């Protein structure tokens, strides 16, 4: 069956995506910086009858990404979809932004996506066909969010890469799209809430409260809500879609 | 089974959407101004082993839309999705636009969508649950297309309606989204090409050639390509998406 | 020597635009269907040393718009800029939208803009040069606003017209742009607030307070803020800008 | 008189902006990594009757940007506007992108803007008032351009920073906007065309001609066209505008 590699699949949205893709019929490579959670997710999948393999990789490292993609391609017998999902999101008061903070966020969120794109392109060529590249964006990648200058800008960058890649890779039978979540219940958001709440000298949940006011559907997102959109982007039903970054955010930003 | 009503389902994109929804498991109401084609499509669906009913309706007439929706709800045993697909697309040289031309296009493309939204809202309420409203937009509803002032503006209006409706109806558990095709092989585009070519003093095909140049995927769209996107919008996989007008245009416009 | 015609110039934003354009050096035609206010504004301008003429016109009527533009062109001795500013904005709960309401709003907001574009195109042609067409849009023309389905969709339509016109008329040396205000202190907003507040059973000001929450700059808009943006759109400094609908809304929507 | 600092003002768009701001009445700090051109431009301004000072700075370095702003603030007697204009734009075939290429482009284009924002914020606070931050974006910052993955994404990031900054800094009476040029006749574009043409094995001018096909106005941009837009963004007429990245690209992208 078809093969997909999902980065940051050890937990949160990445894990949800991996599980959904397995349900969709994909054999999946669980790629993550965290060896323990990657193996835990791969095990959960295999225990339920699916086909998964854990792959340790730091997406900020170009050679590691290529190695991860090739390992998955050889082991799973193919390569049809890559989901560049791994990412970090520290809240960043503008006056306190440092070169170190920018490097950390961009090396993972932006370079990681570029490396994933390149490795997938070569993998598709070696398999002798086209493919689907799916990147993790955010509604903050469409509209700069408050207190998230570095993160928001990194996601805008991902959307830019998504669009240029869609145009440049089209002749190779490759499409490039992205998914844009809103406020999702994962350790990532919990941390943003903590930083923003603490910085405002307010109780935990304050950040969630402020951002949740802009969610039209009136509830935070489940990782599965995002995975459901990614399922479409990994399916042939999205074959005629490219360069798009879909908002699966409960209606925070409208396009 | 879940129930959906598709306007303009007698042919083209509308018919393709209806057939795809049937494959997805929906009982479908084939709504069209053309009674003969609606009945033919419904018959085809029923003879094939699916469930459908044909309803004659001019979407520009509010009472006829409510009647069509209610007939579908009673006959099919429920109402879960409405696809306001019917539309017209005459090319309109700016200096030649008349109020008659504006009325013709807007009465179907804009008013028809408003009536569909209202009728669906009442059907959902009578059923005691939420629902999905899906509107036919166009890439021309995101970026004004040359020689298509009236058509483009009508689709921008449809997207505006889609967004306000998404915000106003969210409390009722109703989502409102749209699909934006590119250049689809149906009699609608055939006519635009003929009009644009003649006005330009160029042989037939000038329109297709000019617009086709912006399609990143380098191929024209099949009605089924659009139906594949609508399938997602009709599925529970789109539950957390609202107020979006997805581009399933082969990459003509990037969002 | 430059000439501009501003529709809906009898009060609010239109009047502010007219006065600013006069300060910028334009001879201005005060177009409005309100004879009293149009003549009062023209009088105010002429008494201060400026050059203006009042012109009676219901922008929903194509012939009247052409006649108004031609009267301005002949009386003021030229025609360089048209500002299609006149508009109406009733709040419209979705369930109660009627064909009459849609017609009232669209005949003024949408058709009025089309007639203005056409009339200006002919005027520029008769003057032997190009020109600037400026349309009144709204942040609600970029993102559908709650309780404003008909109004929002009409402004989305205006933006669509702005874009197609920009592309279609470029060869004639004509640019077409729009301005998008936020919450401006004029009788129009006061009425929206009254309608929304009444519908909700809230004291006057409820609507203003709710919509104001999204204004980044934390203050309501003055008609002069909008006039300052239009000044740019009417000046040669905007010569290389076309097809754009600028947000001069205090930061409600971001592009 | 008001004070403005323009990075990359030694040539191209930056020089044009500086000269226009001088005409508008500003005292300007010519900041550039090229000491020769910076002093040459400052010299031309002072000899012609204006007030300017050359400041050497590599915008990729945070400390240097702060030092440049402070030198400008002390020497020119104030600080009211900053134009983070400096930038680089290499064409980058996706398969050939290296971490080195990304760092070079992002350290200048993205970090440079962050440092400028921070330095400006502190300068404004020290001057005891608000201010205007203006960043150089590009139409490629709204839509990913072919063969320009790294450059396009860096400009998307700039827009992201522009938006978050506008929201975060609003309380300080600071607005943050950007300008988006199209194809401008400067050494930067000349180099992009050379790279793209050589890569395609086609004569010089190939890239220029291909990209120019998307310019609605049908003519290449002059640095002064961009400076004209920045003039508006530096003037009080843009006081009620924030978080916007205006397209002064001849109509390549429409918002
Ligand atoms: N949580 C949200 O609300 C939200 C909203 C929008 C977008 N997103 C995006 O969705 C993606 C998933 O976020 P999430 O909530 O699941 O985050 P998370 O923090 O819960 O999970 C991130 C995963 O990434 C892995 N990872 C981190 N750095 C890595 C690196 N250098 N190399 C490899 N793996 C690495 C982690 O081990 C972890 O399992 C991210 O790109 C995020 O920006 C999240
Ligand atoms: N064809 C394209 O390239 C393209 C691209 C973008 C968007 N769209 C949109 O997709 C939708 C379907 O277009 P299509 O190509 O299938 O068109 P089509 O002309 O092939 O089919 C339109 C259907 O609408 C029905 N219809 C027309 N007026 C009606 C009315 N007043 N009431 C009820 N039914 C009515 C017709 O009988 C017909 O079956 C439209 O909304 C169109 O704007 C089409
Ligand atoms: N007020 C706001 O908050 C706001 C925000 C965004 C956009 N706008 C837009 O700005 C424009 C000006 O709005 P405003 O607040 O000044 O409105 P307003 O109601 O205060 O003034 C409108 C003017 O239009 C004239 N007018 C109305 N219908 C007309 C017709 N058919 N023919 C000719 N003249 C006609 C009126 O006589 C009046 O002088 C409108 O297009 C409006 O949609 C206003
Ligand atoms: N030229 C175009 O067609 C075009 C289109 C869109 C956007 N832009 C943007 O406009 C801005 C100006 O571009 P341009 O055409 O004038 O470029 P240019 O290459 O002609 O001029 C750039 C200036 O930046 C200075 N500079 C470069 N790196 C620097 C650094 N690290 N620190 C300080 N100064 C540095 C250079 O010395 C030079 O004077 C850039 O941000 C560019 O991305 C240009
Ligand atoms: O940077 C280039 C990458 O792809 C190349 O094809 C090599 O096979 C791989 O080892 C390398 O990491
Ligand atoms: O009044 C608008 C519509 O809704 C009403 O409730 C009626 O049920 C329907 O016949 C009518 O067309
Ligand atoms: O018909 C549209 C308008 O333009 C025509 O060219 C005529 O000049 C004018 O009388 C008419 O009202
Ligand atoms: O940390 C960035 C800047 O912070 C302060 O402004 C310091 O005065 C300056 O020296 C430094 O470069
Ligand atoms: Mg803070
Ligand atoms: Mg190539």
Short mmCIF file of C-alpha atoms and ligand atoms in Angstrom, two decimals, chain B residues 62-63 66 118 122 126, ligand 6:
data_model
loop_
_atom_site.label_atom_id
_atom_site.label_comp_id
_atom_site.label_asym_id
_atom_site.label_seq_id
_atom_site.Cartn_x
_atom_site.Cartn_y
_atom_site.Cartn_z
CA UNK B 62 -37.18 31.83 -2.97
CA UNK B 63 -40.43 29.92 -2.48
CA UNK B 66 -37.88 26.22 0.17
CA UNK B 118 -32.32 30.04 4.40
CA UNK B 122 -35.06 25.82 8.38
CA UNK B 126 -37.03 20.98 11.65
O1 LIG E 6 -41.15 33.05 4.35
C1 LIG E 6 -40.02 32.50 3.69
C2 LIG E 6 -40.15 31.00 3.53
O2 LIG E 6 -40.17 30.41 4.86
C3 LIG E 6 -41.48 30.33 5.44
O3 LIG E 6 -41.34 29.91 6.75
C4 LIG E 6 -42.34 29.32 4.66
O4 LIG E 6 -42.25 28.04 5.28
C5 LIG E 6 -41.90 29.22 3.20
O5 LIG E 6 -43.00 28.81 2.39
C6 LIG E 6 -41.38 30.57 2.71
O6 LIG E 6 -41.03 30.47 1.34
#
